[PDB]
Design a protein around this ligand. Structure first.
Ligand SMILES: Nc1ncnc2c1ncn2[C@@H]1O[C@H](COP(=O)(O)OP(=O)(O)NP(=O)(O)O)[C@@H](O)[C@H]1O
Ligand SMILES: Nc1ncnc2c1ncn2[C@@H]1O[C@H](COP(=O)(O)OP(=O)(O)NP(=O)(O)O)[C@@H](O)[C@H]1O
Lengths: 663, 265, 661
DNA sequence: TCAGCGGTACCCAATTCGCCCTATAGGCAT
DNA sequence: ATGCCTATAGGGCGAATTGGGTACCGCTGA
């Protein structure tokens, strides 16, 4: 009912930071509420019996309504002392193994709290042996290890090739590729919004072929809108927008036939802006030059005064027709084209094959690749009279080009919404293509923690492999809440492990998942382990304290340490902890065949292994998960398959049986 | 020891007592959060670390005010023993003593109010480090502000370029003006450099760090005697600019004037 | 005493690719000679009895004076078939473990050679079991595994922080930072050229501080010269070039006093370039605008006719002021103001109350809310002489600016040489500053392979670490040609192994090395191993590594058992002590391998002694002659953050395991 | 071929962050 | 009292810096 809770709060220019401590239990939590109401709610939620605040705490209104208030100096909330004091308190060399190291705003609160805590109770704090971050956002929790290890957007090397991105990123428009990338780094867990994606994707699988080509015409409209807002847009950017505007009626027609209320809602959000289409069609030339600085952008008939300044230019336009023709006749070069340049003025460009067939009257102006631009006095004279009056047309053409923003800026907000909706459509049509192509299934979300996969596969590994993945199922529940996965080196024991992680993540982007059938429960935190002890066990310490009943744990090659007795002993304790205490969803890829005695020791754990058939020095890996344990070591058999000399392999097998004779 | 610079002075004096030829000084937030000095001199024993926590008494004084962590490896092959705040436990350090300090003001909000900004007090830390470096060319001193090395003073062997490091300590403009003055009148032995009065800049004139037996001593009358000698050279009266090492008291001062005047002219 | 040798050669747009085969022994080699003379020397060196060439081989002159020539189709030299055929020949899934995978130019020759070998012989050739890449340049041969592990330019994450670059890269000019980066990926091994750098760096140690500010004025002249050659250079680029030209007299003076023949040679390569500096000063304004498009680039006094067309555009404000005054007097309208408009041009604005009191000469141009703007023939005439003169003066500015390329390109070659020399000076002066700053020593090169470090340290780890690096000695020689480094995690196994690798690499950029004293021998190939794959990289090191090569094995045996890894590590350590006798560092957790110094000759037991007091532990970080005492994952586990309660169970589990073994 | 044509790397250049500085008071032993 | 000294905080200015703009790079169906 009533708790004696100690707490602290601090803010910088960025946001707020919060920490608590219960002296009854020894629970020690941390958070970074970004906005004010979240911060007010967190103080109200925890209801600390004693609350710390910095003398210069700006938004005092939050803490003017809390009890047991304490005014503290600023210097106590310094991160340097905080990190130092908390390291000494827990006996750690870093706070990376609490997953709070990269939350300095809150650690200011935690730092000030502990310095105060060690002093308020002035008692031994062995029960307070860990701090943990509770994210204010409870949609998803993704650490850097997961993004770098599951390879959602970045492979182990650091490249963006053979990622989940690269696979799903067959998006026709670039703004779709980015919205796809953001979704993967922020998997939605509003089951309603996820189902809104799953119903949209199901409806578009059939209509995906018709819409994709229309979406490819649009291009990156979102980045064009960013330049339009800055008033720095280019004519060829406005041409892409006009090209995109012409597609909106076509997209509105194709999405009208699709039976999906979210699609119909997206279709209304899409808009038309056919007024803005009409504007640009009338305003701009069908294919204008690269920059507005050149002019020759805005088509004649839009502005009459542009035509008055371009009255000289109108005479000038068929003067360039008369000069291009006369010079094409005289020289005998048909690739001869007269065009404008802001730096040099008007020039005569000829193809490189016909460049040196030009006469001596032609003076070199610009040297290009597969072209040579020239100048003559008649043009250079004509260039001057045009540059000036067409300059007052170009100044007006640039002034009218700014006025095009003034006609687009009323809808700018609606165009961004439309662009985001168009970008979202590309993503969900792209996913609808991928799901249709790869026959992905729609996973349905349940209330209790667990994933029930029917013949599921690794969504990325199956695409990059030269062999069809051996699809295998998974039955996770709070009854079967742990799997000890033993197997060979380069055996593929880390596939079924990683495939499970992607399936959850792919399910939580509302996208159809790589399996025959999946039924999944709440997975809020993904915690991962992958080799390189001063880096490896630091992550294992972070996954142990942070991981909950709902968190998906993926430990790979754990206990690669100073011996086979230190690594096993830790691995034994970690597997026990996650089965005995936390009872968290854990996927333990390991070589420790001694840990295969845990399914009989522990409740929740199951022995699985990757079947591999070895004949002589060469070997075949079935890459197929079988319920059991690895028969023996295969690094000998793999070593030859990697290319290691047979002299080493023979000597390995000769030294093996001298060591295997002991054990 | 309210000024961080005065604390720095005490810690370097403890490093000179160790006899260290390598000094590295670390500073955080203007020198308030961290004052880490690592030294390669004599390494006080784990027992000598415990009583220094409880020159040892001066270490106890900063340990009570701040959470001073001191780790020292004994000359005898041994793990260094690191005494926090009050916990002494094994540590890794080469033979020698390291004196790390947490926020100097762990229990003094008045001393935080006494702290003057973050840079002006660092400039006072620089001044102290600048003065001891001249006195002891023998010991290397590497200075870092907010974890960023500012000055690289390099240990000078006997017969080595003392002028090069002197030039680094007081700036190149001082060294150029500075004329090497080595005057011995019987028992009285003066060694150092005095900036040329005519072309001496005001900042060089402010730099007048006089060391008696390798201990910085400022006397207005000694300054007046050098200022008189400056006023003898040319009419304009600019502040005396002299860095000297003298082993000696009032009769000396009469021969500090004549001894300096003879070299100046 | 000659052999029957078979070979193949192919070229692309980039360079040449080469391969050979002796049917008597079964040796198979690969190379990529970039230039023609290297390629001619390689054919001359090998002297194959039978030589293959593609029907479309461009530089035929190489092979038209050779014997046993064979004209082959193009398709046989395709990399797709080559990789596929060679993979199934060796029985590998990749050619990464031969160090030839990223050498496609050479593999075209090798691919064509083997397809021809399988057709010439048409018998079992298991005596062909391996290929190897041997680009024995003055440059060290390093796999990208070294460059990603040593963190020369890129840390494990992919950032350029906590690198050897970041530390040594205090270079004032960007073209210095790049030449520093190339040196570190291409360590020079012409011992003469290395000593030329070491004597240069010793002499500039004192003068380093004075030169650096002068070098910061130069900027990236090298990339400006690249735009100058393309005739795409910008006025501010030419300003930086002029700013750099003004420094050459100053640098020639400072480097004249410095006693070092290589410095004096570098000082002559740099050049006075006073004549180019004078031309740029006369021509360009001190600080011109961004582009030539805008004009206002070329200063008055260079071109008389530029100043003529300018004089029209300068006779403007006074003309309009007299007009404004005369028209204000004549009309009697005091609100009459003559101003410029970028959209419409020059106008005459009168307040709306006085707008319709204006005379009949005034033609309407712009109607405003608070006024009426007009145009008159005198203005409209004056508007023409301005607008045209701007353009003609501006056109002359673009033409002169292009003409300045015709005056600069004659020296372009000499400016590139000077730029490379200036970039080299920045590197050298920066390295001299770092050596002065970080108390680095000059390592002296000996004849036989081996590194003798006296209280040496990790050049990067020492810089960013809050605590001082514990100095580490090393005695590598062809007698002590391997060290078994066991101990804890945070023992310093990987540090002492990677510190040795950097020391070699930093010694082989002619730069002063992070140690009190080093005496180093010929190291031709630096090879390193680290987890992401494993067996793949180790094989490349076994196949490529020689008596002289530096081997940096980190935890061989991260496999599938206790024995698979131990047995392999034992065979690899035996191989590199028994057969190859390469300079090898084998930092591993296998305490079982500590029975090698008694088994092998050349191997020596060392360890990073760690003394555990109470629950916590101290790592001496000091290399001691012996082996690891015990397991330390338990001691580290706490230091990683793990709850002590799980360790209390883990230590109890270890105690049961200790009773067995 | 080919003429745009959109992308893409990369060099600026105003902006942001940190460093310096000089009038502006105080300040404390005398 | 007091009078020469001294640190100080806001302001000015320079050095890093990443967004913004340009010259450059393929390149992509037609
Ligand atoms: N069905 C399959 N057929 C062929 N290859 C597969 C299959 N499934 C997975 N693989 C690949 O087999 C390789 C083995 O996995 P890999 O991660 O290299 O080794 P591991 O033993 O799983 N990892 P580790 O524990 O760190 O040694 C990878 O290249 C997988 O992508
Ligand atoms: N000579 C040294 N002096 C001080 N600290 C050191 C030294 N060598 C290593 N360290 C510290 O040790 C850690 C680096 O681990 P390192 O010794 O490189 O790997 P290791 O002993 O092989 N452990 P592991 O990576 O798990 O296999 C960091 O905390 C360094 O600060």
């Amino acid at each position: 009912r009533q708790d004696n809770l100690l707490a602290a709060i601090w803010q910088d220019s960025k946001g707020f930071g919060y920490a608590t401590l219960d002296i009854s239990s020894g629970r020690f939590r941390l958070s970074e509420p970004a906005d004010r109401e979240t911060m007010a709610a967190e103080l109200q939620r925890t209801n600390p019996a004693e609350l710390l605040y910095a003398e210069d705490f700006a938004e005092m209104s939050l803490i003017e309504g809390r009890r047991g208030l304490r005014r503290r100096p600023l210097w106590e909330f310094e991160i340097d002392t905080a990190r130092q004091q908390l390291n000494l308190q827990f006996g750690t060399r870093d706070l990376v193994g609490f997953g709070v190291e990269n939350a300095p705003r809150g650690l200011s609160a935690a730092g000030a709290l502990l310095q105060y805590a060690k002093c308020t109770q002035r008692t031994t704090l062995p029960h307070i042996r860990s701090i943990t971050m509770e994210r204010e956002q409870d949609s998803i929790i993704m650490d850097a290890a997961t993004r770098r290890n599951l390879e959602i957007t970045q492979n182990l090397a650091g490249g963006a090739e053979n990622t989940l991105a690269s696979v799903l990123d067959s998006t026709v428009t670039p703004m779709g590729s980015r919205m796809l990338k953001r979704w993967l780094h922020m998997p939605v867990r509003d089951t309603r919004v996820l189902l809104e994606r799953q119903q949209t994707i199901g409806a578009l699988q059939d209509f995906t072929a018709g819409l994709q080509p229309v979406l490819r015409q649009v291009g990156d409209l979102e980045r064009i809108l960013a330049r339009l807002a800055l008033r720095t847009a280019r004519p060829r950017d406005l041409a892409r927008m006009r090209h995109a505007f012409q597609q909106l009626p076509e997209l509105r027609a194709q999405l009208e036939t699709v039976d999906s209320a979210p699609v119909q809602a997206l279709r209304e959000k899409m808009g038309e802006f056919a007024e803005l289409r009409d504007l640009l069609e009338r305003a701009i030339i069908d294919t204008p030059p690269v920059l507005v600085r050149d002019g020759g952008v805005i088509a004649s008939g839009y502005n009459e005064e542009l035509d008055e300044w371009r009255a000289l230019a109108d005479g000038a336009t068929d003067y360039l027709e008369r000069l291009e023709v006369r010079e094409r006749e005289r020289t005998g070069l048909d690739t001869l084209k007269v065009g404008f340049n802001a730096v040099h003025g008007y020039y005569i460009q000829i193809s490189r094959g016909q460049s040196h067939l030009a006469p001596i009257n032609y003076m070199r102006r610009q040297t290009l690749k597969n072209a040579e631009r020239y100048i003559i006095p008649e043009l250079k004279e004509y260039e001057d009279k045009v540059l000036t009056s067409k300059g007052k047309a170009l100044a007006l053409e640039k002034q009218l080009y700014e006025e095009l923003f003034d006609l687009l800026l009323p809808h700018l907000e609606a165009l961004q919404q439309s662009a985001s909706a168009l970008a979202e459509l590309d993503v969900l049509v792209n996913l609808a293509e991928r799901a249709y192509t790869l026959n992905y299934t729609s996973p349905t979300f349940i209330d209790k923690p667990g994933i029930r996969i029917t013949e599921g596969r690794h969504p990325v590994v199956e695409q990059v492999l030269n062999e069809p993945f051996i699809a295998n199922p998974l039955n996770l529940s709070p009854q079967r809440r742990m799997l000890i996965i033993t197997g060979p080196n380069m055996g593929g024991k880390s596939t079924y492990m990683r495939q499970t992680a992607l399936i959850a993540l792919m399910a939580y982007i509302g996208s159809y998942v790589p399996a025959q059938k999946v039924e999944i429960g709440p997975i809020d935190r993904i915690f991962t382990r992958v080799g390189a002890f001063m880096v490896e066990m630091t992550e294992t310490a972070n996954i142990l304290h942070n991981a909950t009943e709902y968190s998906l744990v993926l430990m790979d090659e754990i206990g690669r340490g100073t011996s086979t007795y230190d690594g096993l002993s830790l691995a034994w304790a970690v597997a026990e902890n996650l089965a005995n205490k936390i009872k968290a969803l854990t996927l333990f890829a390991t070589h420790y065949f001694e840990l295969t005695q845990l399914p009989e020791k522990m409740e929740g754990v199951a022995n699985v292994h990757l079947d591999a058939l070895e004949h002589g020095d060469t070997i075949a890996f079935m890459h197929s998960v079988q319920d059991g344990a690895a028969s023996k070591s295969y690094g000998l058999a793999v070593a030859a398959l990697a290319g290691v000399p047979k002299e080493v392999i023979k000597r390995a097998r000769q030294k093996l049986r001298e060591l295997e004779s002991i054990s | 020891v309210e000024r961080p610079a005065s604390v720095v002075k005490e810690l370097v004096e403890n490093s000179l007592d160790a006899g260290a030829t390598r000094i590295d000084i670390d500073i955080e937030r203007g020198g308030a959060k961290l004052i880490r000095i690592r030294d390669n001199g004599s390494g006080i024993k784990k027992d000598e670390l415990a009583l220094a926590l409880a020159r040892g008494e001066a270490l106890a004084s900063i340990s009570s005010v701040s959470r001073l962590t001191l780790t020292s490896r004994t000359a005898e092959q041994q793990e260094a023993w690191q005494a926090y705040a009050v916990t002494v436990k094994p540590a890794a350090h080469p033979v020698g003593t390291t004196l790390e300090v947490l926020d100097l003001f762990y229990n003094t909000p008045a001393r935080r109010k006494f702290l003057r900004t973050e840079k002006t007090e660092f400039n006072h830390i620089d001044e102290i480090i600048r003065r001891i470096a001249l006195a002891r060319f023998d010991v290397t001193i590497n200075l870092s502000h907010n974890g960023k090395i500012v000055r690289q003073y390099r240990a000078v062997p006997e017969g080595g370029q003392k002028e090069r490091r002197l030039g680094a300590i007081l700036g190149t403009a001082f060294l150029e003006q500075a004329l090497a003055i080595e005057w011995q009148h019987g028992d009285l032995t003066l060694r150092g450099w005095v900036a040329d009065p005519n072309h001496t800049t005001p900042a060089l004139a402010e730099i007048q760090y006089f060391y008696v037996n390798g201990r910085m001593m400022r006397d207005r009358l000694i300054n007046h005697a050098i200022r008189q000698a400056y006023e003898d050279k040319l009419g304009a009266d600019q502040q005396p600019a002299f860095v000297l090492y003298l082993e000696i008291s009032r009769l000396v001062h009469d021969f500090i004037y004549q001894g300096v005047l003879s070299v100046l002219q």
